[PDB]
Design brief:
By secondary structure, this protein is of the alpha+beta class. 25% of the residues lie in helices and 20% in strands. It has an eight-stranded mixed β-sheet with strand order 1-2-10-7-12-5-4-3. Strands 6-11-8-9 form a four-stranded antiparallel β-sheet, with no helix packed on it. Helix 1 links the parallel strand 1 and strand 2. Helix 2 packs across helix 4. The radius of gyration is 19 Å and the shape is globular. Bound molecules: fe (iii) ion. The site of fe (iii) ion (FE) has 3 residues, from loops. Belongs to the iron/ascorbate-dependent oxidoreductase family. InterPro entries: DIOX_N (IPR026992), IPNS-like_FE2OG_OXY (IPR044861), IPNS-like_sf (IPR027443), Oxoglu/Fe-dep_dioxygenase_dom (IPR005123), Plant_2OG-oxidoreductases (IPR050295). This is Fe(II)/2-oxoglutarate-dependent oxygenase. One of its GO terms (molecular function) is metal ion binding.
């Protein structure tokens, strides 16, 4: 079976909005086409990123994360826990709110890197709003339910470089996990991403065609939608033949309210998840064998 394709051009109107529902229900991931981000900007994100990661280690470490919160920023794969078996180099940048940016962690070379990221992040923010408004409608909440919870909310840019692994094995790479976000927007450089999603025990490949985006909702959305849609467990395996690049835009909600299923979804529909503080939600998704939001089922 093929990866579901969702056309942002047509996301109003039952035909394409229902395609989104059957993709959220069956795959958890979907491929987004006609999303309004120009192809040459996506190319630049990928190419300038590759250029940043192919530098000598000394240049990259000038942006290395500092050590004295949970969401570490800068260059490295630390989480006294460097993640050697990820087989990956990483750059993590807080992009939103724009006020809270810290340019000491943004690469100054290639010269365009900052401007290209900020340009691409304006496009994915708009995609986030469109996707999330469609979902509110699917949930038969009103258009702007989440938009209000998305004000001054954190958004991170996670850049991944995966050099080839001569000895691929499942102990290497990104291990099975669900995202903690409200929404995740992923940009990959090639038609081999290594990204896989577990559906009813089975792992399926998630591949992007040229210049499309891979979207999934995270655990924040699953609690808020009372599990009507589920945050998918996924992993990124290693590759012996090619190098790979990706950028994930990681969209969370703000500190204001608490994380609980939407009241408008609760008498024949009891709440599947307990309410908890955004501060306790963060600590639990960063905080392991068992999956955090399971401990919220009740
Ligand atoms: Fe993930």
């Amino acid at each position: 079976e093929p990866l579901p394709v969702v056309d942002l051009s047509r996301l109003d109107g039952a035909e394409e909005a229902t395609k989104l529902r059957v993709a959220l229900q069956n795959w958890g991931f979907f491929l987004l086409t006609n999303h309004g981000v120009e192809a040459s900007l996506m190319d630049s994100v990928m190419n300038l990123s590759r250029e940043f990661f192919n530098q000598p280690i000394e240049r990259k470490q000038k942006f290395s994360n500092l050590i004295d919160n949970f969401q570490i920023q800068g260059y490295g794969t630390d989480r006294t826990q460097d993640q050697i078996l990820d087989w990956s180099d990483r750059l993590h940048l807080r992009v939103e709110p724009k006020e809270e940016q810290d340019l000491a962690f943004w690469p100054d070379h290639p010269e365009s890197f900052r401007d290209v990221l900020n340009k691409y992040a304006s496009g994915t923010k708009r995609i986030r709003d469109d996707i999330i408004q469609a979902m509110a409608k699917l949930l038969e909440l009103d258009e702007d339910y989440f938009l209000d919870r998305l004000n001054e909310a954190p958004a991170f840019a996670r850049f991944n470089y995966y050099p080839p692994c001569p000895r691929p094995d499942l102990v290497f790479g990104i291990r099975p996990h669900s995202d903690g976000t409200l929404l995740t927007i992923l940009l990959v450089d090639k038609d081999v991403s290594g990204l896989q999603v577990q559906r009813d025990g089975k792992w399926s490949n998630v591949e992007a065609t040229p210049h499309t985006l891979l979207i999934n909702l995270g655990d924040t959305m699953e609690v808020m939608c009372n599990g009507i849609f589920r945050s998918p467990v996924h992993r990124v395996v290693t590759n012996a033949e090619k190098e790979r690049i990706s950028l994930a835009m990681l969209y969370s909600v703000n500190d204001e309210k608490d994380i609980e299923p939407a009241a408008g979804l609760l008498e024949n529909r009891p709440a599947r998840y307990r309410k908890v503080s955004v501060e306790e939600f963060r600590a639990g998704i960063f905080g392991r064998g068992e999956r955090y939001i399971d401990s919220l089922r009740i």
